[PDB]
């Protein structure tokens, strides 16, 4: 099957891109594996129009609106191989598809420290993004898990949402500079080894003592969901927390005819930005179909 | 009356301003939106191209967003127009009502105003059968007949694009004359050129030419000029640059203008023209404005 564009990933970025291509009366296929990065929280925040709505509902509304266009197609599957040919995609199911252009919108995967109790609380009481989930902590106690330079900056912003403690876990020991800057912002440093997280977000130390937090934040590392960008030769840069696919102003990668949007690009990390640069990418892809 | 000091005031309360204000509200800071109630998109019955809001009424989109923002008790709204902005030892905004408001930082989100050509009947049909943006309204023309009202060199590229959505006539109207490469290009794309002067637009979408001929269209497009809705950006000393279709307020990667503590978002910035873009860079502006409150 030949399409004008195939969009790999059918969450916020992919749907936004696909909608532009559909509205341009071109034949577009979304191939989506169905595991969004935000499948862990009960509510989304920060997107005007969708504030406080469930992520499942946001994603379903968008799928419904895209598929109102009969020239848009959907397939629940995973792309395992992409190659120049236009482009040919091979899916985990064994199905092959072809397209003149591609839009990469497959997202990133969060990689968490190996701390007993932490991962089961992801999106419930342990978070990455204070604009996304800080407000609902209601000014209570917040723990920031230390893990390098960006943790220190996060801890310095976090007092906006509640009383903040920087937790070193007996590993990430701040230097003189970092240390003095925390003390001025009123951020306590706790250096004890953490054995596990219990209850809502209570840190239990190796010596048994507990520190009860209302929420924990981590500036955790992220990986690309798929090797498809690397297969296609798309330039990938290494950010402080993980890789992203390079793009220009029109969201085009270093590989002509392959565009990228959402969390896999440099300005990502939120739904608002996924929607915005997804739309840029979809319009750009269409413009390249017409003018080259 | 009791004194108020807002961490941020957002001037303009449509897509861009609401998106910015929401970030600030979620950062537990005090935010005021002052909005004059005249969105650029107050003429069309449906909005398109924003995933989640595709095909919904602009009025409903605006109302839903306003209600969501005002659910935060640290967010406030005023239906007013800022007539003057000045720097003090933060910022003071003077409104048409005579009310004054005080802010530490500002987000400009006041949009642009479409400057339509003086063609009889065109303004009456703006947002009904006459449009600016083909991604916004091309699809609903259903492969119909489309007229591209000539406005100069930029109308040529529009005419070359429009066959994606329907059978296209380039109404050059003495504003443009294709050379040879361009006439061949239009011809290869299946675009008809009509050179006679346009007298009038009548009925729903019929072009009435100087010689008396009538051409019925299903929709018309104009690559019209736009101006900033307010002099507030200039009052604040914000650098303004001339774009191909009108001026924009200059912004850096953090959506900050040349004036520290004044940010901008939406159609008044270099990348605009759509709601999706307004929401995206409004969110950038709100987060950036918050970050400056904390770190300077
Ligand atoms: C716990 C948590 C809470 C969050 N809360 C918020 C919030 O409140 N507000 C906010 O703005 N942001 C929030 N975020 C960030 C937000 O989730 C992302 O910014 C957003 O989901 C990015 O959208 P995306 O389309 O780029 O990728 P994703 O939403 O991750 O979607 C990627 C899609 O591509 C698919 N895919 C992956 N590989 C393949 C393949 N090989 N073939 C086909 N399909 C594939 C996946 O299955 C998935 O469906 C949160 C993140 C987390 C972790
Ligand atoms: C007919 C038409 C149809 C369109 N359809 C679509 C579409 O379907 N999809 C799409 O994505 N885009 C569409 N657009 C483009 C879209 O309207 C804009 O991109 C978008 O509205 C810009 O958002 P904004 O918040 O920057 O500005 P606006 O939506 O214009 O809002 C600016 C607000 O600021 C207020 N304001 C102005 N001056 C002051 C002041 N001095 N003090 C206080 N408040 C002030 C105004 O009253 C207004 O409420 C359309 C445009 C037009 C003209
Ligand atoms: Cl998060
Ligand atoms: Cl790249
Ligand atoms: Cl970058
Ligand atoms: Cl005051
Ligand atoms: Cl404060
Ligand atoms: Cl328009
Ligand atoms: Na949201
Ligand atoms: Na992601
Ligand atoms: Na994103
Ligand atoms: Na609109
Ligand atoms: Na409302
Ligand atoms: Na003409
Ligand atoms: Na805009």
Q: Do domains A1-112+220-292 and A113-219 have the same CATH topology?
A: yes
Superfamily of structural domain B1-116+224-296: FAD/NAD(P)-binding domain (3.50.50.60)
Give the burial class of B43: count Cβ atoms within 10 A of its Cβ; 0-12 exposed, 13-18 middle, 19 or more buried: middle
The strand pair at A215-218 and A126-127 is best described as parallel
The experimental method is X-ray
Per-residue H/E/C for A37-84: CCCCCCCCCCCCCCCCCCHHHHHHHHHHHHHCCCCEEEEECCEEEEEE
Residues A110/A98, Cβ–Cβ less than 8 Å: no
A127 at interface of B, judged by CB pairs closer than 8 A? no
Distances (CA, A) of B129 to A69, A270, B207, B225, B255: 22, 36, 12, 18, 34
What gap in Å lies between CA B283 and CA B276, rounded to an integer? 11
Among candidates A134, A226, A27, A86, which has minimal Cα distance to B25? Answer: A134
Give the architecture-level CATH label for domain B117-223: 3-Layer(bba) Sandwich (3.50)
Q: Which residues contact A71 (CB under 8 A, 6 or more apart)?
A: A22, A25, A26, A27, A28
With breaks defined as C to next N over 2.5 Å, after which residues does chain A break? 85
The strand pair at A108-111 and A126-127 is best described as unpaired
**Does domain A113-219 sit in CATH 3.40.91.50?**
no
What gap in Å lies between CA A129 and CA A241, rounded to an integer? 13
What gap in Å lies between CA A31 and CA A77, rounded to an integer? 6
Ligand 2 binding pocket (C-beta < 6 A) is: B 11-17, 34-41, 43-44, 47-50, 81-82, 109-111, 114, 127, 131-133, 136, 229-230, 232, 266-267, 272-276, 278
Per-residue H/E/C for B100-169: EEEEEEEEECCCEEEECCCCECCHHHECCCEECCHHHHCHHHCCCEEEEECCCHHHHHHHHHHHHCCEEE
Residues A201/A211, Cβ–Cβ less than 8 Å: no
Superfamily of structural domain A1-112+220-292: FAD/NAD(P)-binding domain (3.50.50.60)
For the record, the structure tokens of B252 come out as: 């850096």
Report resolution (Å) to 1 decimal. 1.9
Ordered by start, the domain boundaries in chain B are 1-116+224-296, 117-223
What gap in Å lies between CA A134 and CA A258, rounded to an integer? 36
Helix axes B15-26, B58-70, angle to 10 degrees: 20
From the CA of B192, the nearest ligand is 14
Provide the terminal-to-terminal Cα distance of chain A, rounded to the nearest Å: 22
Provide the terminal-to-terminal Cα distance of chain B, rounded to the nearest Å: 31
Residues A292/A256, Cβ–Cβ less than 8 Å: no
Q: Give the closest of A49, A52, A276 to B277, CB-based.
A: A276
**10 Å Cβ neighbour count for B28?**
18
- Hey, is B66 helix, strand or coil? helix
**10 Å Cβ neighbour count for B32?**
24
Residues A237/A228, Cβ–Cβ less than 8 Å: no
- Hey, is A227 helix, strand or coil? coil
Residue B201 falls in which region: left (phi positive, over 0), alpha (psi -120 to 50) or beta? beta
DSSP state of A113: -
What gap in Å lies between CA A122 and CA A224, rounded to an integer? 19
Q: Which chain A residues are within 8 Å of B295, Cβ to Cβ? A: 156-157
Among candidates A210, A263, A287, A221, which has minimal Cα distance to A35? Answer: A263
Q: What does the buried/exposed string (b/e) look like for A146-168 if buried means 16 or more CB atoms within 10 Å of the residue's CB?
A: bbeeebbebbbbbebbbbbbbbb
């Amino acid at each position: 099957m030949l399409f004008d564009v195939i969009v790999i990933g059918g969450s916020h970025a992919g749907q936004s891109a696909a909608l532009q291509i559909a509205r341009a009366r071109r034949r577009v296929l979304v191939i989506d594996a169905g595991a969004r990065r935000n499948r862990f929280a009960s509510q989304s925040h920060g997107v005007i129009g969708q504030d406080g709505r469930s992520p499942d509902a946001i994603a379903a509304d968008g799928k419904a609106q895209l598929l109102a266009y009969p020239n848009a197609q959907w397939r629940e599957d995973s792309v395992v191989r992409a190659e120049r040919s236009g482009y040919t995609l091979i899916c985990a199911s064994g199905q092959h598809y072809r397209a003149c252009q591609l839009v990469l919108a497959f997202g990133v995967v969060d990689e968490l420290p190996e701390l007993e109790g932490l991962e089961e609380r992801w999106g419930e009481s342990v978070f990455h993004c204070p604009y996304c989930h800080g407000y609902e902590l209601d000014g209570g106690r917040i723990g920031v898990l230390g893990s390098g330079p960006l943790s220190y900056l996060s801890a310095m912003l976090m007092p906006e949402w509640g009383q903040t403690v920087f937790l070193t876990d007996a590993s990430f020991e701040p230097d003189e500079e970092q240390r003095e800057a925390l003390a001025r912002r009123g951020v306590e440093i706790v250096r004890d080894r953490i054995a596990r997280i219990v209850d809502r977000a209570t840190v239990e130390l190796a010596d048994g003592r507990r520190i009860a937090f209302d929420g924990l934040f981590t500036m955790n590392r992220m990986r690309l969901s798929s090797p498809v960008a690397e297969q296609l030769g798309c330039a990938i840069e290494e950010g402080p927390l993980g890789p992203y696919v390079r793009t220009d102003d029109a969201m085009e990668t270093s590989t002509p005819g392959v565009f990228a949007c959402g969390d896999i690009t440099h300005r990502g990390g939120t739904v608002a930005l996924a929607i915005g640069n997804g739309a840029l990418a979809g319009i750009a892809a269409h413009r390249k179909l017409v003018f080259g």
